[PDB]
Amino acid sequence: AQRQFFGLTYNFYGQPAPLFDLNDLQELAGCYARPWTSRFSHLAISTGSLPVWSARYPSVASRNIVVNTLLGAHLNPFAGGQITSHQGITWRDPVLSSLAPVPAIQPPPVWAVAENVLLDSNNYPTYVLNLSSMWPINQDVHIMTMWALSDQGPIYHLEVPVDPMPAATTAALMAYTGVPIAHLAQTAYRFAGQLPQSPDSTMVSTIRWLSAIWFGSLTGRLNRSRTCNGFYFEFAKPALNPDQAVLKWNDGARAAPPAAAQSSYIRCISPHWQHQIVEVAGALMSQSVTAVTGLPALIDEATLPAWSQGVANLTGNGQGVVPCLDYNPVPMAAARHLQWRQDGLITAAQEAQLNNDYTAYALTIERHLTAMLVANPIAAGRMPIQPFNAADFGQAGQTAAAVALAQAMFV
Amino acid sequence: AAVFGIQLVPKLNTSTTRRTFLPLRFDLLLDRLQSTNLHGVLYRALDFNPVDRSATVIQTYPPLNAWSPHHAFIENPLDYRDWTEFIHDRALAFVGVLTQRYPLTQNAQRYTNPLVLGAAFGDFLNARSIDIFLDRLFYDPTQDSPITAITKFPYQWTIDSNVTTDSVRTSAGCKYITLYGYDPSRPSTPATYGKHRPTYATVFYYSTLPARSRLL
Amino acid sequence: NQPLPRLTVAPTYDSAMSNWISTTIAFFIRVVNSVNMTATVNDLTRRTM
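Output (structure tokens, whole complex):
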């Protein structure tokens, strides 16, 4: 199995208490059911099937970004050792099964409102003693810490063993073909979130390879022509919502295996991530892997927020680090198209349009986040949109770097 | 300071180095076993009475401490007389079984495997076929001592030495065997710790850390 | 508990079960050859037991 996880809470963006409403606690972690492996029950085959627009949570990622804040205020055990309680709320039992109003006669010591508290699955001697049971809380704090170490888009991880796909990993994928990127992260997430599965387990390879192929596609390389072992993701033609992704085992030239171990931490860099069901289901999925395998190594420090420096066990700076790249959906897709255009996939006059098509699309998932941003302030104690300042949108982050990290990953 | 009822003197003092684990060569194991007197070399009467050759308890060492008797040995225990005789016999007669399968002259400079050697000897006493253990009674120091037990073979059937891919479930040794005439009643008899029993523990050897998580 | 065997089985006299029957049946053999028993219960009959 795996008995060791290190987390880091969200950052109260220049704000007092944790940016989550009581109305939220009873909107995700409520109903008394275990708020744990629920993160995914708020996503659809796409975006047009969710209440992710003008509403309490105006974003295809506004849910997790909230449930994640709510998790910070109720994770004191892993911080210090005791259970504590934040505003009349504290886990019912030592197993942290769920949340519930403070008892009445034996209330837990009121939590201490502190931002960015590190976490150690050791500071809580009961966790590992029950592992199996509260297994979920692990993979979750992990999903958290991969969004917390970042400020503008979750930071997942990518791999590619120098070997060919693990047979029973080409068989497991060939049964997930038609399935959309959403339902893939689904199985991915749903999987590594119940019963400690050994990192050796088949599924981990499969769901870890499904996070390497998704990336190759997101950067042309692993396209309809140059597939992985036979797979690649086909994105919906921009003009009718290109924010899609479906796995498709083809049979064109197989992108030869890399010359070595290709590891790197990639995170969406522009606010765009917050509303692209594919930029989340994908990233979220790549995180399903890390959750049941500790954490490859230390994520490079360089490009990362101010509250994520030398974050013990997580962030690094020295050798045990892996350069962390951050791409921008538009500056990205543009090259993703150029790649297609080069492999004869499309016409030479069709990419100067494919971009128009998609670029206008990104301009739509832009006047929307800004609207929701200047709709749900932040001083309002809530953070469904997560501040971003009308700027990062164009921000041509690493991008160019990851577009190269994709080629070396699928030579 | 003091922890509960125990009082702890201020000064802290521990050994400052660890001797590199040394695996017994095949010849040394052959001499240890075939020595004039096994007492001291293999087993050692904890409280041997001078007057008469009698010993309530006997703490044992390596190729013997592994062994865990079968029911017939527990019920109707022997006296320090026939006990020395029992071993002085079996220790020798065992060297035979093991040496005829590995002529000392040609392969003495080969380290025996702590684990298998234990189960291979303990199983010999209980009178269980020892054929399988011999196959890998040796191992190159480079390959882990507990790994050779797995690499050579993932044999999950031999009672008291179930070797899986990552762990080897064997019955803990018996650092103490009690010869007839032993009683935990007297305050004088040496603290056996229940190990005079056959199955008081179950040593699970593991290969790698992930192999251990799967165990716990 | 022991792992299922894929070879041939033959009633063995080792194992908790087996041992439990062997030591306990060894106890009542002691109850029968004890002082009490030995004085009361007849002799030849006590052998039969």
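Chains C and A do not touch (no CB pair under 8 Å).
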